[PDB]
Design a protein around this ligand. Structure first.
Ligand SMILES: Nc1nc2c(ncn2[C@H]2C[C@H](O)[C@@H](COP(=O)(O)OP(=O)(O)CP(=O)(O)O)O2)c(=O)[nH]1
Ligand SMILES: [Cl-]
Ligand SMILES: [Cl-]
Ligand SMILES: [Cl-]
Ligand SMILES: [Cl-]
Ligand SMILES: [Mg+2]
Ligand SMILES: [Mg+2]
Ligand code: NA
Ligand code: NA
Ligand code: NA
Length: 326
DNA sequence: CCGAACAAGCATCAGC
DNA sequence: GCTGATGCTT
DNA sequence: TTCGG
């Protein structure tokens, strides 16, 4: 964290633009700037120095000069004073409350945590569970707990069907010492891009994890993506572990490598790689890499037999998961 | 100058 | 009900 | 807000 003050400032600006201004491109620009500065291996001495990095333009360069001179950004100082901005920023911290609902809640006088708790019947299901576990979902998961969670998930999936493969992705697969949640990629030979030979493949796994009281709540659930809540079991007389967000993604087995690339991330790494794919004439999603035709319409999926194959297509040298934490 | 900026699953809603 | 747009999320 | 053509 050579430049943690700068990257925190840019992250706070990004969140302001997303949550309050609902300006998604500004949000992305600030986040890209913070990510490129975060990996820059020198302590930044001037905006001009920072402007040399891709993603830092004139306006962010100027803010970095103000920050280095004074330790503060007046723009941010005033955003923190604004009650409506501060209200909206808080409400979006609840899972399921985004920029639109936060502002809508604002027009109704429902601001504080106390307000939300009094008006549970104004919340959809996702928002209600996000409020229920508001405190817990702000805590990080130590890697040691991620390992215990991995063991439960993999073993419970094995008990349903030994042919399932469950892989923990996200920051865990990138080797992080702590994670914000648990991301589980799931495959089964019956589900490929060619056929679905078994129904309920994701459901059966969700059900088993509920039976053993690992999964405790559901935020959303369809045939290939589960979003919910889990909790490690605690010993006698021990305080309970925090409840944790879990995401499970069932991916066609023949498309595992595109799937595990997507689900390992980071999010900014994915955006950067997909942007580069487009410049190289390809489009990458969690399923396939496809060439872009002369008019820019995706062609047919290219053959992929490793994560590295995807990097090769777009002429990037391979990056291990630990080096994708952008 | 100015168009593009990653891609998509699930929940919800409007309109038919 | 279906379709398509939108919100929220990964 | 930034970049690329
Ligand atoms: N193309 C894209 N892909 C994405 C995007 N958002 C998330 N993802 C992908 C990449 C993430 O690693 C993966 C998990 O998403 P998660 O939010 O859990 O991110 P972690 O890397 O695990 C940080 P942690 O706080 O959870 O520890 O989902 C996206 O906008 N666009
Ligand atoms: Cl914008
Ligand atoms: Cl500040
Ligand atoms: Cl693949
Ligand atoms: Cl596809
Ligand atoms: Mg995660
Ligand atoms: Mg571009
Ligand atoms: Na730059
Ligand atoms: Na939120
Ligand atoms: Na996640």
């Amino acid at each position: 964290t050579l430049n943690g003050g700068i990257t925190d400032m840019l992250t706070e600006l990004a969140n302001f633009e997303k949550n309050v201004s609902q300006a998604i491109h500004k949000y992305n620009a600030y986040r890209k700037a913070a990510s490129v500065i975060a990996k820059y291996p020198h302590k930044i001495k001037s905006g001009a120095e920072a402007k040399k990095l891709p993603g830092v333009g004139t306006k962010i360069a100027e803010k970095i000069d103000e920050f280095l001179a004074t330790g503060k950004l007046r723009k941010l100082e005033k955003i923190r004073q604004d009650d409506t901005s501060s209200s909206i920023n808080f409400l979006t911290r609840v899972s399921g409350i985004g920029p639109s609902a936060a502002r809508k809640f604002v027009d109704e006088g429902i601001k504080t945590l106390e307000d939300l708790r009094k008006n549970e019947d104004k919340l959809n299901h996702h928002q209600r569970i996000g409020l229920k576990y508001f405190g817990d979902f702000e805590k990080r998961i130590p890697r040691e707990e991620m390992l215990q969670m991995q063991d439960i998930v993999l073993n419970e999936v094995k008990k349903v069907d030994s042919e399932y493969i469950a892989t923990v992705c996200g920051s865990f697969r990138r080797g992080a010492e702590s994670s914000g949640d648990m991301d589980v990629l799931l495959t089964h030979p019956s589900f490929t891009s060619e056929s679905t030979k078994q129904p309920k493949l994701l459901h059966q796994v969700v059900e088993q994890l509920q039976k053993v009281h690992f999964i405790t709540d559901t935020l959303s659930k369809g045939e290939t993506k589960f979003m919910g809540v889990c909790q490690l079991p605690s010993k006698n007389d021990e305080k309970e572990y925090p409840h944790r967000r879990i995401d499970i993604r069932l991916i066609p087995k023949d498309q595992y490598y595109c799937g595990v690339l997507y689900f390992t991330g980071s999010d900014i790494f994915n955006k950067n790689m997909r942007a580069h794919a487009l410049e190289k004439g390809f489009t990458i999603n969690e399923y396939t890499i496809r060439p872009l035709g002369v008019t820019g319409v995706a062609g047919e999926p290219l053959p992929v037999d490793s994560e590295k194959d995807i990097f090769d297509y777009i002429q990037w040298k391979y990056r291990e998961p630990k080096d994708r934490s952008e």
